[model samples]
Target: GFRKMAFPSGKVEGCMVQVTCGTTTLNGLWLDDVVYCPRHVICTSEDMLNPNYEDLLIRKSNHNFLVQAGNVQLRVIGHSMQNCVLKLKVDTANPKTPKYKFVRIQPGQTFSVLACYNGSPSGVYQCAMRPNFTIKGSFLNGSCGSVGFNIDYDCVSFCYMHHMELPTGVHAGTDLEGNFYGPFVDRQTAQAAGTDTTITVNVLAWLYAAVINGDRWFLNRFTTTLNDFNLVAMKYNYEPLTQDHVDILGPLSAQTGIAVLDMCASLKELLQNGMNGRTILGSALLEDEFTPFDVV
Candidate 1:
């Protein structure tokens, strides 16, 4: 499948030349090396501003007429009257070599350019040129046109993904460094456990409330205090969570029970999600307080 080429300035510098099989030359072939080729090349501004596709024409053909390992060549025979340069480039989809720069050509000599790709089962591709080039008054500065070409072979499609597992336990506290942290496993227990889950929960909640309202900080504290019964919920063997087939956050073999207290630790993160953690904690955390708790 081929798409028409778009031109940025509706102009190119060179004339198009035709390729022949043996001595038989085809019509519609002319060669010019100007940045604006009137025959087959397209021209555009450096910034590639507004471009029109309707003004440019392009052709596509398969390499079935050549050798078994068919050879396709785009040859340009031309001479420069003054000191000039020509550049050639190969463009491809590989990210590593997305683009390449070409070489410079000299003036007043016939130059034959060749770009060939083998036409075997593995040798199917496309080629093009950015033939636009111009030299300013000084040799120190000149403008070379932008050009690109592509190559590819038949291949299957594929996709890949990366999966990363989270740490063993979700630690919610910070140290004196004031950096919030989570631990991959318990430190003291031979088998990983949450001996310090409460402290972690409190610290995480404190910072959680500090950013919202100081009074809410106390409310968060009170909620932690009342939910102490659930502290047993942090360990793996806690009957109800396990009976319900719930996954406790800590080590399975550790003596610790389920840490429901640790579960309440998520209040701050959950509150920021727009749900009122205090309301969820009302009957559970603040049964003693009659008023709705707001950031004071």
Candidate 2:
């Protein structure tokens, strides 16, 4: 099954916290990749049946799925003490797998989403809260009935993106006004140039947009985005003066349409001095940058 949640940008720290409950433990469970599909990024619902979107991010650690105490305490306080109620549910009517009998959450918390997967397993397993609160919960249920070459598949897959276009017309629920909703913008559309490197640049641009507009909180719910962005940056080996190893040399160069050969010169000096070799998006990449409306 799958799940969804929303968080407030400022109040909630963007961090990935894992939890488990019920019959089985979440120790050996593996959380699959995260997918981000903007509203404009359309595909046949049938294509969604088994489509392979680019790996938006990578898994941080194979076994670092430890539940953070700080996040758990925060959630507990938010739901009970602070009057924030997180709604958790699962979609058990989808085709991926049919109903998981026993669903468990680690650390044995009372506020976790504990539900039996119905016959249909394609539904979402989500925990959502409201009014300036951060929420992120991974899933780990029983195995799927079908198998490929006798390989037992007991894993969790998350859909981080919503493919629906900007809601049209007005009837209370429709996104009539452009302020709240409109032409859904996605990474695919942002990368006007269809090269792999271009796509990576556009993804970084979207990340920057999220950072500026406070929508990065949603990206923070995803652990893979951080890792994948790092991998892409490392591949280029373009270490710039940023918190993480992520550099915008390529994007900057592309934006200006001029190959700035010396753009990464300072980055080389910084890397040679043996500074912390992690790529981070700083205010330079964020400040005054045109924030993309659809990336959120």
Candidate 3:
């Protein structure tokens, strides 16, 4: 039984080289220092993608070789320069017939096979080549051979999920003066929570009535004044605007002249109550309405 090994971190430790079966000469065929060799190695890429080895290389051995990784079996029957024909079967107490397929590979090319079992009884199995294999080319080195490679098995499970707190299209952030600003429910959360349609209908209906009555200027002034309320909300008691806030605006818009300032004072009271007195506005502070002289 082969024990599982931890994958190497950062760069790999060795390079793929050509080996002669009985010969002691070790020729450095290529230098591979990448995290993943099969995908990054120049030689491996050429061997598999060059298409010169499209057909299977004729093998001298007809014997079947079996490699085991935990409860899985890789039965190799034959090989070509392009692919190796093998049967992958999950071995159990009561085993079923295995499935056969062709695994693409370069002649004498070294690669890795990764299989994951996901369940309560899940485990991971892995194996690797020993970096010693002859390069099949114009000149053949040692005999096409089979070595007992180690199979490593580990009982492990990976659980991963993502939960988003804020809704879409809404960005929350603090200002340089340390004030939080952004949309209330955002678009996604508003829609999903059944608040978007309600808010949209109320806002559009108000806008339509305001425009038809030639109260567009009043609408503009009301919008400008609302900014003062939002600043106060963000600075003292942070809360998203609710239906109550929108409803009061309609009554506020019906006032005239200096009466608009009176409306602002009333709105601040309602907003304070809505926020449960998290913040209190000073009675002497009368600059609650947007005006031409106020700092832009």
Candidate 4:
């Protein structure tokens, strides 16, 4: 009961592009042989003995191995990265695994905290993007340990090449998903929200300390812009989020790590609704029968 047809890590011109990091493993089992890990290493596309795919890569111990292959087991790491807000930290060594920190991380892009790929486990593998990006780890026991990320953000688009304005005013108030939250106190409510009164802004990043999993939950991100982050779900206050709000939290940073950061902020609100580079390449892999995990 198996069929195959998937592969397309190409065709993305600009604004941001890098595709092809696809992995779907479950009924087909291969959680790096289950429980334990470490799989292949031969990328001329495929046809190596112990070959299994999950679009994976874990080589930023400080970078040095520059080779690209498709189907997990890979490498890609960079700093400076035109600063576009990124700071990730997740942990797990034994049974307790699930701690996704950094409420919002928008940079060139890349998120890996994988688990069992070669020898078993499956949710997704690949999920690529580019200034260089391709990620998929909404979960996987966060992938047998080892994950590090930190980025400030693209200067908000590098302050739009020196054309910036702000007072956080004018177009102030539109949230139930109408967008802009606002910055203006008055101006007759910006003439009854007609439009632009004035604007300006840039280079801002701050998070004094955000210890999600390690502190059993801790995020006191200090002063700065980017919607001044003040995290509070009241452990279970409210939101239309589900997975039983991740089975009523408690599987890590509670409420399934804020419902897996609202499912990766619903793909950062679908790459902020302006998709030049649409994400999560290979698409769906949601099958029941008690989700994956059959062998090792």
- Per residue, candidate 2 scores C-alpha lDDT tens digits across 182-222 of 22232223212111122232234444443344432223111
List model 1 lDDT by residue over 1-296, tens digit each. 01212222111112122323233222111112221111111222321233232332122122211111013243323311111111111121112221212232211111111111121111111111111111111111211112211111221111100011123321111111112122322122233323321222222323233333323332233233323434433442221222111232223212223232343444333333434454332222321111111111
Off by over 4 Å in 2: 1-251, 257-260, 274-296
lDDT of 3 by residue, 59-172 (tens): 223232223323343333432221111111212221221121212221111222221112111122222211111111111122111111111233111110001123332112
Best by lDDT: 3
Cand. 3 TM to true fold: 0.15
**TM-scores of all candidate predictions against the true structure:** 0.14, 0.19, 0.15, 0.14
Which scores greater on TM-score, model 2 or model 3?
A: 2
Clash count of each predicted structure:
18, 20, 6, 42
- Give the poorly placed runs of model 4, Cα more than 4 Å off: 1-93, 96-98, 101-104, 108-146, 149-296
Model 1's lDDT to the true fold? 0.22
Model 2 poorest 10 in a row by lDDT: 77-86
Best by TM-score: 2
Enumerate residue pairs that collide in model 3.
3-152, 4-152, 4-153, 56-80, 57-80, 57-81
lDDT, candidate 2, equals: 0.24
